[PDB]
C-alpha cells in the first residue's frame, strides 16, 4: 500500500449509486449501441444507436398522448428533459414518436443531413445523459458525428442492462440545467 | 512497457517550411501527459509543448501541439535557423514513469553536394609504434548518407573501421566524414594497395581513392 | 443558486459531526466513517464532488425514510431538489474538461489519506478519468503529498487547541 | 533571483565505483515540486533515470538503475541528490535534474532544468594523445592531424596556433575498443601554399596536462 | 449554481499559482502577471468581477487550443458553460445598480496596487462607471487605502511564515 | 448563480458596517441595529435566511427610493433581481424539510443573543416551525449555547486586536 | 502617479474583450441608433432604433424558417435569446420577421401604444444586450420610453462597427438568465 509522509496510507472508496434507484434516474451503458436510463425497480428507458428504424412516419402526437394519459409520467419527463436539452433543434420532421397504449417510442433520424447537423444536437444530448460509458458509443468544437442512422428511445423493463458501466445519476442530474437552453422560438 | 516512436527519424526541410513531427505510442494515452522538448547540443532540453497543446513560456508560437489517443503531433509553421535541432516527445504515468521518444532531428535541406574524397597513408611514427591508421576523408557533402568501403589488395574489409561525422556546417549546411581503418603493423605490410570507396548520391559513379605503400 | 442541504449524522458518535457511508452506499467495501473536520468542509467548499455526493446520498436516505413510497416511482422530488444537493456547475466543469481531453471526475471513485495509527481521514477527493482510463496515482502524487501536509497541519492545530 | 537549478558533482570513476550528483534550487519554492533525473548516454536519446515526489514520500527508478541508484532530497537545503552506486560503463552519460509538479491542475512537464553533469565510467587511465600527421598527397589539398589513444575527453585542436581557422573540420571522437578515444582534425588548403606555408596542429588535452604541436609536411 | 472553472497557469513560474494576462488580452498594454495570493482568492470570492473575467479568458484560451475550430462560429459552448465561468448574479448586481443610478462595473477597466520595489500586486478591482462617466480615483480613495493595508498585512503574514 | 447584493448602511455610525432594521420592517417592535461583525457574515455565508432577508429589505428600500413608482405595480424588477438577493436553494431546503416533517424556517421569526451590558448582538438565526407549531427554546437550547460561545470567542478576539 | 502608503503605486488594466470573439458574442455601440452584437469574424447582428420600417406585414414565419434551415444557427439563437428575455410580451402582431433565403430580419413595432407598453419590454431587453454603450440610445421603475418607432434586428457583415463603445460579452452573457422569465402562458 502507498504511504505518504510515513504515516498516511492512501485509500479509496467507490460509491454504489444504485442505492439512489428509488429517488432519481440511473444511467448506464450496456455496449457500444445500447444505453439505458432506469427509474426505480420496474421501468426504464433504452437509448439505441442503430441503423434499423422502428417508425416510418413523421408524426409525434404528443398532444394526443397527453390527453390519453396512459404513459409513465416519469419516463415522459425524461423524454421531455432529453428533447428540451437538444441545442438548436429545428427539424421537427427528424423526430418521430409512437405513444399508442402508453408506451414510449421516440426516434431521432440522425441521417437528415458538421456542427449544423441535427445529429450533432441529438448526439450531444445523448452524450451528456449516458455520460458514464457513452465514450464507447462514438469517437471538433464539441460537435460530434456518427455512422449510425437513428437514435431510438424506447421504454424497457428493469433488467441487468448495466453490463459495461455501473449505474450513475450524474448524467441525468447535470442535464437538467440544459433544458430550454439554446432553444429556438417558434 | 510504453514505447513512443517518433517519425521521421530525420526530417530534412529548408528554412521557412512547415515541419510536422510525429509521435506514436504503444498504448492509448491521456493527452494531458504528452510533452515535447527541443534539445540543442550545447544546452539542456527545452520544454516546448505540455498537455499535448499548451505552449510553454518563451516558445515562439510557430511551435504547436495536437493529438489524441495514440498519435501526437508537434508542428513548426515556419522553420527558422535556430529551429534545427533534436525534438523529443514525452509521456508521464505509465512504465517507464517518464517515457521518451527516440528523437527526431530536423536538418537543413540543401542542394545535393558531392563529397571530395582524400586518402591519407599511415605516418611512419605510427608504424614505429606498431599500429597503422589509414584515414579516408569525405569533405563538404549533402545529404549525410554516404557509404565508405575499405578495400586492401582488392579485398572488402569489415569490422576494422570506425566512422565519425561532423555536424551540419552553420554556413553551407554540408557534412564531412572520416573513416579510420586501424590495422597492426604486421597486417599493414602484408598487403600493398589501400583504397577507400565512396558512394554518395552526388557522385556520378562510386569514387575510389587509393595508395600503394611507398 | 447555491447548495444548502445539511448532513445530519451525529448520533452515538464521540463528537457531533462527520458522516458514515454505510455498506449499502459503497461498492464491495465495509462502512467508512469520516470525521467532523473533513465533512464540515462540505458546508463551505463550492467544488468538492464528494461533498455533493454526500448530500445526494443523505437526501436519498432522508427522503426514503421520511416520505412514503409511491406506487409508481416519481422523479418529481429529485427534479425539485437537485440544486440544493449538488452544484450543477461542478459537473458542468467536469463535462467541459471531458469535452477538452482533460482528466475529469465521473463521481464514482474517490481517494483519501488515512493515518495508520490514529485513523484520522482526509476529505475524499475524486479520482479522475479520461476516455475510460483512470489516472494513475503517479499522475497526482504531489496532490496526495500536500493532502498529507494539510493533515499534519491540522493534527498540529488540534494538539495546540487541546490544552 | 532567476528560476534555476544549479548542478554539481560528476566526473570519472571506474566500474563498480560511486558518484553523488546534486542539484540546488534557486529562486523557486523547491518543496512544491517533484524532482527528476534524466541522462543522455552518448549517441543515444533522452532517458529518464529516477524521480522523487515533492515531499520525498515516493521515489521511482528506471529499471536499469534500480538497486544501484538512490534519489533523495533535502527541502530545508532546497537540494536534490542522486547517489549512483555500482556504476557500469553504460552509465556514461550527461545527467540533468529537472523539476515537475504532479497535480490534477496541471499537465505533466519538466519546465526547469539544470545544466549538464558529465559522468564517465571507465577502467581506462588518463592518458595524453599521440598526434600523428595526415600528410597531403592542382586545386586544393587536404592535410590534418590524427589525435589517437587519449582519455578522457575533451581535446582542443587548433591550427597554426589559432591563426588558421577557415575550412578546418575537427571530427567528433570515436571510442575505440581499447577504452581510449581517437579523432582526426583536417583542413583543406590551396595546393600552391604547400611549400610556402607551414602547417601546425596544436593538440591540448587538459585532463592529462599534455600540449602537443606537430608539423604536417608533404611526402 | 456556483462557478467552478479553475485557472491553470503554473508553468515556469517561481511558485505554482497566479495568472498572467498576455498582451492579446489587454488593451494597449504589455503582459501583466498576478501572483498566487491574489489570484487564489478567485477560488473563494463570490463577488469579484475580475475573477469572473479571469475564468472567461482562460476558458476562451483553453477552448480554442483544445477544441478544433468549426466552419461557422457556434455559440453553443459558451451557452453551455457560462455559469461555470461567471456569476450571472454578479452582473445582475451591476445591472440593478445601473438601473438605480449607482456606480457600477462594466467589466472593462480595473485597478490594483503595485509595490514599488517588490512588485507585489493586489487582486484588481473593477473601476466603476455611471452614465458613461467613470469614477475618479478620489471617489474611492479610501478603498485604495484599505487595499494598501491588506497588502501590508499580507506582507507581514509572509515574513512571519517565511521562517 | 450566487447572491451579490451588498448592504449599504454606514452613515452616522461609530464604525462602517452593520445594518439597522427600522420600525417599519419589524412587527410591533422598535428599531434594532446589528453591528458589522454580525452583518459582515452575510457577505460570505450561503445558508443564513436572515441574511437573505436583509438583502431583500435593503433592495426594497433602495428600489423604492431610487426608482420612480409606476402607475400599476409591476413585479418585473423583483423577478429580475430575486436571485441576487436570496438563495433560492436555501428556501428549497426549507421546503424539503417541511415536506419531510423536519422543523423548517418560514423566514418570519428570528432569535439572537444580546450582551446585557455591552449590547453586542449575534447574527439572528431563524426560529424554526413545523405544522404551524414553532419550536420551543428548549428544542434548540444547545444552539443558543454555542452562539454564546462564539460571542465570547469574538469578544476575546476583539480585546486582543484592540491593542 | 498615485502612491498609497508610500510604497504601493496605483495601476490600471483594461481587458481586450475581442480576444473572445471566437467563443462568445460581442456587443458594442456604433452611435445612438446603431448597435451591434457580433459573432466571430464573419457574421453578426445589427440592432437599429429607427423611424423607418422595413417590414409592412405582420407575419413571423419561424416554423417555415426552421424547416428550410437556411439561417445562421448562432444568430437564430441570439434572436431567440433576445425575444425570450422580453418581459410580459403579449402583442405578437408587434413583431414582424422575414427569413427569406436564410437572412435574419426582425422588426419590433415600438409604436403599438408607460410600463405596460410592449416597447418597454423590448427596450429593456435592448438595454441589457447592448449594455456597453446603450446609455446613449435613450434617456421610472426601470420602465423606458423612446421617440423611435421601431427596433430592427438584421444580420450584418463583420466590419469596424464598434465606433462608440468597445466590444464586450457581458450584455449577452448576463441576458442568458432572463430567458423564459416573466414569460406568459399561451
Ligand atoms: C398522429 O396524428 C395524425 C393526425 O391525427 C388526426 O388528427 C389529430 C389532430 C387527432 O385528432 C388524431 O386522432 C387524428 O387521427 C395521424 O395521421 C392521420 O392518420 C389517419 C390514418 O389512421 C389518416 O386517415 C386517413 O385519411 C386518408 C385521407 O386523408 C388524407 O388525404 C386527405 C386528402 O389529401 C388529406 O386532407 C388528409 O389530411 C390526409 O392526408 C384516407 O384515405 C384513409 O382512409 C383509409 O386509410 C386507413 C389506412 O389503414 C384505413 O384503415 C381506413 O379504413 C381508410 O379506408 C384514412 O382515413 C389521417 O388523414 C391522418 N391525418 C393527417 C393529418 O395526416 C397519425 O396517424 C397519428 N400518428 C400516430 C402514431 O398516432
Ligand atoms: C498506469 O500505469 C500502468 C502501469 O503501472 C503499473 O501498474 C499499475 C497498476 C501500478 O501497479 C504501477 O505501480 C505499475 O508500475 C500502465 O499500464 C499499461 O496499460 C496499458 C493499457 O492502457 C497496457 O497496454 C496494453 O497492454 C495489453 C496487455 O498486453 C501487454 O502486457 C505487458 C504487461 O503485462 C506489456 O508489457 C506488453 O507490451 C503488452 O502490451 C495489450 O493487450 C494492449 O495492446 C493491444 O490491445 C489494445 C486493446 O486491448 C489495442 O488497442 C492495442 O492496439 C493492441 O492491439 C496494450 O498494449 C500496458 O501493457 C500496461 N503496462 C503495464 C506495465 O501494466 C497504464 O497505461 C498507466 N495508465 C495511464 C493512463 O497512463
Ligand atoms: C408567412 O406565411 C403566411 C402564410 O403562409 C402560408 O401558410 C403557411 C402555413 C405556409 O404553408 C406558407 O408556405 C404559406 O404560404 C404568408 O401569407 C400568405 O401569403 C400568400 C401570398 O404569397 C397568400 O396567397 C394569396 O392568397 C390570396 C387569397 O387568400 C387570401 O384570401 C382568402 C380569402 O379571404 C383567405 O382565406 C386567405 O387566408 C388569404 O387571406 C390570393 O388572392 C393571392 O393571389 C395573388 O396574390 C399574389 C400577390 O403577389 C400573386 O403574386 C399571386 O400570383 C396571386 O395572383 C395569393 O394567392 C396567402 O393567402 C397568405 N396566407 C395568409 C394566411 O395570409 C406570408 O406571406 C408569409 N410571410 C413571409 C415573409 O414569408
Ligand atoms: C434501491 O433503493 C432502495 C432504497 O435505498 C434499496 O433498498 C434497500 O435494500 C437493502 C437490501 O438490498 C435493504 O437491506 C435491509 O437489510 C436486511 C438485512 O440486512 C442485514 O445485513 C446488514 C449488513 O449488510 C446489517 O447491517 C443489517 O443490520 C441486517 O442485519 C434485509 O433482509 C432487508 O432486505 C432490509 O430491507 C435496505 O433496508 C433497503 N432500504 C430501504 C429503504 O428499503 C434497494 O436495495 C435499491 N436497489 C438496488 C438494486 O440497489
Ligand atoms: C479573435 O480570437 C482569436 C482567438 O483568440 C484571435 O486570434 C489570435 O490573433 C493573434 C493576432 O491578432 C495571433 O497572434 C499570433 O502571433 C503571431 C506573431 O506574433 C508575434 O508577436 C507576439 C507579441 O505581440 C509574440 O509574443 C509572439 O511570440 C509572436 O512572435 C502572428 O504572426 C500570428 O497571426 C499568430 O496567430 C494569435 O495566435 C491568435 N490566436 C489564435 C488561437 O488563433 C483573434 O485575434 C481575435 N480577433 C480579434 C479581432 O481580436
Ligand atoms: C419494486 O419495489 C416495490 C416497492 O418496494 C418497497 O419499497 C422499497 C423502497 C423497499 O423498501 C422495499 O423493501 C419495499 O418492499 C415493490 O412493491 C412492494 O413489494 C413488496 C414486496 O416486495 C410488497 O410487500 C409491497 O406491498 C409492495 N408495495 C408497496 C411497498 O407499496 C414491487 O413489488 C417491486 N417490483 C418488482 C418488479 O420487484
Ligand atoms: C431519415 O432521413 C433520411 C434522409 O432524409 C431518409 O432517407 C431518404 O429516404 C427516401 C427513400 O428512402 C429518400 O428521400 C432518399 O432517397 C433518402 N435519402 C438518404 C440520404 O438516405 C430516411 O428515409 C429517413 N428515415 C425515416 C425512417 O424516415
Ligand atoms: C450503418 O450504416 C452506415 C451507412 O453509411 C454505415 O457507414 C458506412 O459503412 C461503409 C462500410 O462499412 C463505409 O464504406 C462508409 O464509409 C460508411 N459511411 C459513413 C461512415 O458515413 C455504418 O457502418 C452502419 N453501421 C452498422 C453498425 O452497421
Ligand atoms: C412499454 O410500456 C408499455 C405501456 O406500459 C408496455 O405495454 C403494456 O404493458 C403492460 C404490463 O407492463 C400491459 O398490461 C399492457 O397491456 C401493455 N400494453 C401495450 C399496448 O403493450 C410495454 O410492454 C413496454 N415495453 C417494454 C419493452 O417494456
Ligand atoms: C482508516 O484505517 C483504519 C485502519 O486501517 C480503519 O479502521 C478499521 O475499521 C474499524 C471500524 O471501522 C476499526 O475499529 C479498526 O481499527 C479497523 N479494522 C480493521 C482494519 O479491520 C478505518 O476504518 C479507516 N478509515 C476509513 C475512512 O477508511
Ligand atoms: C508592477 O510594477 C513593476 C514595476 O513598475 C512591473 O515590473 C515591470 O515588468 C517587468 C516584467 O513584467 C519587470 O521585470 C520589471 O521590473 C518592470 N519593467 C519595466 C518597468 O519596464 C510589474 O509588471 C508590475 N505588475 C503589474 C501586474 O502591473
Ligand atoms: C440589546 O439590548 C440593549 C438593552 O436591552 C438594547 O439597547 C436599548 O436600545 C437603545 C437604542 O436602541 C439603547 O440606547 C439602550 O441601551 C436600550 N434602550 C432601552 C432598553 O430602552 C439594544 O437595542 C439591543 N439590541 C438589539 C439588536 O435588540
Ligand atoms: C406600427 O404600429 C402602429 C400603431 O399600431 C401603426 O400605425 C397605424 O398605422 C395605420 C396607418 O398607418 C393605422 O392603423 C393608424 O393610423 C396608425 N396609428 C398610429 C398610432 O400610428 C403602424 O402602421 C405600424 N407599423 C407597421 C410597419 O406595421
Ligand atoms: C421619429 O418620429 C417621432 C414621431 O413621434 C419623433 O418624435 C416627435 O418629434 C416631434 C418633432 O421632433 C415632436 O414635436 C414630438 O413631440 C415627438 N413625439 C414624441 C417624442 O413622442 C422623433 O423625433 C423621430 N425621430 C427621429 C430620429 O427622426
Ligand atoms: C444576411 O444573411 C443572408 C443569408 O446568408 C445574406 O444573403 C446571402 O449572402 C450569401 C453570401 O454571404 C450569398 O451567397 C447568398 O446568395 C445571399 N442570399 C440572399 C438571399 O441574399 C445577406 O447578405 C446578409 N446580409 C448582410 C447585411 O450581411
Ligand atoms: C479512447 O478509447 C477508445 C477505445 O479504447 C479508442 O479507440 C480511442 O482511440 C481512445 N482515445 C480517444 C477517443 O481520444
Residue numbers in the entry:
A (entry chain A), G (entry chain A): 59 to 171, 179 to 204, 209 to 255
B (entry chain L): 1 to 214
C (entry chain a), E (entry chain a), F (entry chain a): 260 to 422
D (entry chain H): 1 to 137, 143 to 224
The study reports:
The LASV glycoprotein (GP), the sole protein exposed on the virion surface, is the primary target of the humoral antibody response. The mature, trimeric GP protrudes from the viral membrane as a tripartite complex comprising the stable signal peptide (SSP), the receptor binding subunit GP1, and the transmembrane fusion subunit GP2. Upon reaching the mildly acidic interior of early endosomal compartments, GP undergoes a pH-dependent intracellular receptor switch to disengage from α-DG and bind to lysosome-associated membrane protein 1 (LAMP1).
To overcome this limitation, the GPC-B 18.5C Fab, which binds lower on the pfGP trimer relative to GPC-A antibodies, was used as a crystallization chaperone for 36.1F-pfGP complexes. Application of crystallographic symmetry revealed that the pfGP trimer bound three 18.5C Fabs and three 36.1F Fabs. In the 36.1F structure, both the fusion loop and fusion peptide are well delineated, ostensibly from co-crystallizing as a ternary complex with 18.5C, which targets an epitope that encompasses the fusion loop. Meanwhile, for 36.1F, CDR-L1 residue K32 forms a salt bridge with GP2 residue E287, and the adjacent GP2 residue I286 makes a hydrophobic interaction with CDR-H3 residue L107. The CDRH3 of 36.1F contacts GP1 residues N74, E76, and M96, which are poorly conserved across LASV lineages (left). Furthermore, modeling of the M96R substitution present in lineages LI, LV, LVI, and LVII suggests that the larger arginine side chain would sterically clash with CDR-H2 residue L104 in 36.1F (left). The slight variation in approach shifts the 36.1F light chain away from GP and results in an epitope that is ~95% GP1 and 5% GP2.
